[PDB]
Amino acid sequence: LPITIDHIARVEGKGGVEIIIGDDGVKEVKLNIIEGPRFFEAITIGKKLEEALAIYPRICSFCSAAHKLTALEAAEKAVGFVPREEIQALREVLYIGDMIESHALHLYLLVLPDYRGYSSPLKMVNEYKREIEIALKLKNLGTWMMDILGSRAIHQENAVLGGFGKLPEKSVLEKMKAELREALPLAEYTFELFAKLEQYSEVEGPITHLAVKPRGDAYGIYGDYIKASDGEEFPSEKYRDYIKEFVVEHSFAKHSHYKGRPFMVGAISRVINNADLLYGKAKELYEANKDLLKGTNPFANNLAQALEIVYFIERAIDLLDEALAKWPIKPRDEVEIKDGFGVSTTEAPRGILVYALKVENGRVSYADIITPTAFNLAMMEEHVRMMAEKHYNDDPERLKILAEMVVRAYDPCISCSVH
Amino acid sequence: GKVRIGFYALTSCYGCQLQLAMMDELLQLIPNAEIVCWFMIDRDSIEDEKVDIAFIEGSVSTEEEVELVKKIRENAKIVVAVGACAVQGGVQSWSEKPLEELWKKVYGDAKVKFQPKKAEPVSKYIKVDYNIYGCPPEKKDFLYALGTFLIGSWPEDIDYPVCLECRLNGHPCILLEKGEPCLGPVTRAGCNARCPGFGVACIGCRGAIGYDVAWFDSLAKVFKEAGMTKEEIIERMKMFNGHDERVEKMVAKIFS
Ligand code: SF4
Numbered sequence: 001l002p003i004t005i006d007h008i009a010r011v012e013g014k015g016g017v018e019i020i021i022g023d024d025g026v027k028e029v030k031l032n033i034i035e036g037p038r039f040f041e042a043i044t045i046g047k048k049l050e051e052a053l054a055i056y057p058r059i060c061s062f063c064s065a066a067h068k069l070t071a072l073e074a075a076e077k078a079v080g081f082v083p084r085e086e087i088q089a090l091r092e093v094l095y096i097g098d099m100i101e102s103h104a105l106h107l108y109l110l111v112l113p114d115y116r117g118y119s120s121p122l123k124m125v126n127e128y129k130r131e132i133e134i135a136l137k138l139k140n141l142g143t144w145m146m147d148i149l150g151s152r153a154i155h156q157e158n159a160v161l162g163g164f165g166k167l168p169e170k171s172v173l174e175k176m177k178a179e180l181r182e183a184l185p186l187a188e189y190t191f192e193l194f195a196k197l198e199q200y201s202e203v204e205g206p207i208t209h210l211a212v213k214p215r216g217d218a219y220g221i222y223g224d225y226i227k228a229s230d231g232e233e234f235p236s237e238k239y240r241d242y243i244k245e246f247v248v249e250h251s252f253a254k255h256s257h258y259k260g261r262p263f264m265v266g267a268i269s270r271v272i273n274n275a276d277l278l279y280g281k282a283k284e285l286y287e288a289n290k291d292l293l294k295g296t297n298p299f300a301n302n303l304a305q306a307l308e309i310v311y312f313i314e315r316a317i318d319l320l321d322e323a324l325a326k327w328p329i330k331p332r333d334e335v336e337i338k339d340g341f342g343v344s345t346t347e348a349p350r351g352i353l354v355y356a357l358k359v360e361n362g363r364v365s366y367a368d369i370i371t372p373t374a375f376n377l378a379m380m381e382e383h384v385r386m387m388a389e390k391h392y393n394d395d396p397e398r399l400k401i402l403a404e405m406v407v408r409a410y411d412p413c414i415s416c417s418v419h
Numbered sequence: 420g421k422v423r424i425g426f427y428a429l430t431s432c433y434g435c436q437l438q439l440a441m442m443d444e445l446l447q448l449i450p451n452a453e454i455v456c457w458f459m460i461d462r463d464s465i466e467d468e469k470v471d472i473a474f475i476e477g478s479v480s481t482e483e484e485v486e487l488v489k490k491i492r493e494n495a496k497i498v499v500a501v502g503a504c505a506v507q508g509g510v511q512s513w514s515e516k517p518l519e520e521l522w523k524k525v526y527g528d529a530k531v532k533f534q535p536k537k538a539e540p541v542s543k544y545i546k547v548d549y550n551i552y553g554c555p556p557e558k559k560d561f562l563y564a565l566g567t568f569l570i571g572s573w574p575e576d577i578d579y580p581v582c583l584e585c586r587l588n589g590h591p592c593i594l595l596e597k598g599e600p601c602l603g604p605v606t607r608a609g610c611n612a613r614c615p616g617f618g619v620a621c622i623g624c625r626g627a628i629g630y631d632v633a634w635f636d637s638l639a640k641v642f643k644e645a646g647m648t649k650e651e652i653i654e655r656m657k658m659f660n661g662h663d664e665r666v667e668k669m670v671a672k673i674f675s
């Protein structure tokens with residue numbers, strides 16, 4: 001008598017949970033990832049670099065801009081291009097735009113119904129007017145950012161090799177800084193709402209947390225070193241040395257070990273490895289809540305996203321100030337498709353994103369992608385195990401609710417996991 | 420009664436779903452309707468319930484999605500294929516390489532309990548009653564469709580190229596002044612010429628249309644002047660029309 005959840009609701013992509021139970025209790029938790037493969041890594045082999053660069057964001061809609069912007073860095077490292085200071089700033093800000101919209105989507109429309117009794121965020125519209133009003137303002141800030149700078153909130157054709165196809169008038173960026181700092185109190189509200197939600201003790205235990213170390217001096221999205229919470233730190237191009245993938249019979253996505261063990265990536269993993277690097281109200285909200293942002297609990301992920309919303313809202317007011325001070329900005333530069341190899345690791349909202357691109361004859365000869373949910377799938381399976389062990393004899397529909405609550409704390413985008 | 424609407428997912432980036440979900444007063448613009456299956460936002464959805472309108476997003480890329488679209492077709496009065504993935508098989512449909520070679524290149528020799536097929540649109544296995552175009556489609560492409568359906572009318576699709584929409588907004592033609600290989604002449608309109616509006620050629624995300632009107636004085640002339648072979652246009656069009664068996668003929672006719 002296995003206990004199956006055929007289609008997990010309120011996640012991105014198609015997935016199931018199946019618990020195998022026996023005499024000794026719960027023996028196995030299988031996350032059946034049925035989202036068909038689309039073979040991105042293979043079919044862009046032997047297509048022209050820009051043609052494939054335009055297609056890597058269809059891997060995922062929630063993290064669309066993370067894909068396009070990370071693949072750009074890798075190609076721009078292969079051909080040896082290097083961006084300019086302000087083009088990289090506005091890049092980080094289009095990315096931040098995707099941080100805010102994704103986080104808000106996930107905290108408010110995907111997670112919060114569980115703690116409120118609702119199967120659906122659509123349903124709680126009339127019982128939680130203030131909360132949803134705030135959801136839609138934060139989401140819609142991030143969606144506006146990606147329209148202005150990326151051309152679209154899903155699949156950002158304005159981010160191209162060498163910079164952007166077209167940059168907005170200066171007045172628009174200044175309005176963005178207005179709309180940003182107006183959102184800050186809404187970001188704080190959200191932190192507080194989520195600070196008061198239960199981190200279920202059944203999943204409390206040790207976790208290994210890997211995050212990209214930011215270059216420069218702040219909490220960020222770009223960098224060349226991957227820290228692990230054990231105290232290690234290894235270069236991003238060697239990601240294949242310290243992180244081993246493998247197929248499993250019940251998933252189209254590939255699991256990953258670090259030193260042969262499951263680990264987790266995402267907002268909490270970044271807060272564990274990198275919290276000293278915060279500033280602004282995020283710093284204090286961290287320093288006043290260190291006991292809520294421990295490495296020993298996946299539900300701490302939800303509150304960290306809220307903490308990140310606060311930070312990036314400030315971090316982006318400062319990044320625009322940098323770009324705004326190289327004004328005017330020629331929107332993009334010539335890029336010579338001289339051959340090369342390029343590896344890039346960024347923090348997508350869900351954790352580390354690794355694009356490895358090799359160019360022969362201005363064509364793509366080699367491509368390697370690993371998405372943060374693909375990293376996380378193994379840890380997720382273990383945390384569901386700990387939940388399902390303290391409740392396999394409870395009411396099934398109750399076991400079901402808490403297993404899925406665990407799954408939703410990772411903010412799984414399964415489509416990212418099977419590229 | 421209420422109009423029973425479901426939204427169902429094949430293999431996709433979920434962007435078409437997400438566009439709907441982000442339409443803000445969405446609840447207030449389907450007041451005639453009830454959403455009975457939509458797993459991405461509703462824990463109570465039921466898949467084998469019958470519906471008045473079925474929205475399907477994504478290409479048919481597994482054996483279970485095959486048997487699934489035959490279930491939706493059987494359980495739904497109107498089947499609406501939604502997005503470049505479900506209408507044309509999507510960007511995941513523009514290698515012609517066979518499944519095994521792709522399996523072998525990405526997974527090695529490993530196996531997986533479930534059965535992956537070659538990316539394929541919904542039209543391949545069941546009868547589709549309407550298509551909403553784009554990758555992702557616009558908010559207004561959903562407002563229009565949901566709008567026309569919920570009153571008893573039947574929606575219709577734009578069949579003229581992006582170029583009409585590009586000239587109306589006054590965008591410089593980057594195909595001409597810049598020689599970027601814009602697919603506007605052959606991509607249906609609807610997006611308000613977004614991409615040329617940012618100085619980037621269109622990659623055909625809303626599906627190939629027939630070039631039966633001389634919107635250029637000589638597209639052949641410009642295509643040759645800016646150095647773009649018939650083979651080069653056909654492959655760029657494959658990016659979103661990997662199964663369109665006319666694509667090859669429309670280009671050769673242009674270069675005639
Ligand atoms: S058609 Fe485009 S937006 Fe829609 S699911 Fe496919 S890739 Fe995503």
Ligand code: SF4
Pocket residue numbers: 581582585586590591592593594595601602603604612615620621
């Ligand atoms: S070819 Fe492209 S840039 Fe030129 S008018 Fe048509 S859509 Fe606009």
Ligand code: SF4
Pocket residue numbers: 157554581603606607610611612613614615620621622623624625
């Ligand atoms: S210009 Fe072309 S690629 Fe861009 S949104 Fe319109 S149809 Fe899609």
Ligand code: FCO
Pocket residue numbers: 060062063066067348349350351352353371372373374413416417
């Ligand atoms: N966040 C996110 Fe998507 C995944 N996994 C990416 O990158």
Ligand SMILES: [Cl-]
Pocket residue numbers: 114115401
């Ligand atoms: Cl609960």
Ligand code: NI
Pocket residue numbers: 012060061062063064413414415416
């Ligand atoms: Ni994703």
